[PDB]
Design a protein around this ligand. Structure first.
Ligand code: RCO
Ligand code: RCO
Ligand code: RCO
Ligand code: RCO
Ligand code: RCO
Ligand code: RCO
Ligand code: CL
Ligand code: CL
Ligand code: ZN
Ligand code: ZN
Lengths: 21, 28, 28, 21, 21, 29, 28, 21, 28, 21, 30, 21
């Protein structure tokens, strides 16, 4: 999930768009 | 724990900015 | 609108706090 | 809904709870 | 007080309510 | 690492929201 | 209204910083 | 109080430090 | 109301995220 | 500057990039 | 790491408060 | 830099002022 991807490593803004509607 | 709680707090903010009008789902 | 953009940023923070593990959709 | 309802008028944490899954 | 209670394990909104005026 | 400081930063934002018009005291240490 | 609600959220953060060890009372 | 003082015009650091304990 | 100061506060957070390691001047 | 460009209409992340170092 | 990333975001907001109308320079550069 | 010095332990006001322009 998002916490495993992004809390454990920095998600750039580009990566973060995978979680947009 | 708290580390995760503050992390998510800043993720939600980043997601708000990147997602824009489209919006986002936040489900830990 | 920026006033709405600023407001939604605080809304998203309050929903994060309010919804805990349940999470939330933010869909303008 | 939320923006219209919660940006003209202050939503309590109570009424914010409607937007939780 | 609150830092000791709330900075390693998450306090629910309801627990935080004890620190209100 | 400045963990207490970051933590208290979010604490006071949660208290702001939880406590509404009653407000709160923030008395660290 | 909402604008005072958004503002006070910032004031609280700013008081946190400024007041440091002494802490603070927020009354709206 | 503070909202009346500081949400109408910008409060300086010294002004805000008025509300410290 | 104190709107451009609240706005500046969100703008610097947004720049923090968009600029990254490049960083940025914030010059009002 | 940026407050003038960006505090009435939303500057996208794209446009904010212009202010980066 | 994520810690320093979350910390930087608070630093920038403190800089914004501290520096006022001077403004400031944020550089994560070591 | 600001990160290694301010993130490992708390920075003073005056230390922050370093970065003012
Ligand atoms: O990977 C992350 C974690 C928290 C905030 C953010 O912008 C990115
Ligand atoms: O009605 C609102 C708008 C923004 C944040 C919040 O907690 C409530
Ligand atoms: O335990 C905590 C720490 C920080 C914010 C919060 O809502 C709870
Ligand atoms: O007058 C104000 C209003 C909001 C935040 C702040 O630092 C000052
Ligand atoms: O134009 C703006 C104003 C404030 C925050 C933001 O992300 C964009
Ligand atoms: O040392 C620090 C780190 C983050 C915010 C701050 O005011 C000081
Ligand atoms: Cl705001
Ligand atoms: Cl944090
Ligand atoms: Zn934080
Ligand atoms: Zn705001």
């Amino acid at each position: 999930g998002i916490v495993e991807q992004c809390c454990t490593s920095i998600c750039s803004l580009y990566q973060l768009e995978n979680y947009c509607n | 724990f708290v580390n995760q709680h503050l992390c998510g707090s800043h993720l939600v903010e980043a997601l708000y900015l990147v997602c824009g009008e489209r919006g986002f789902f936040y489900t830990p």
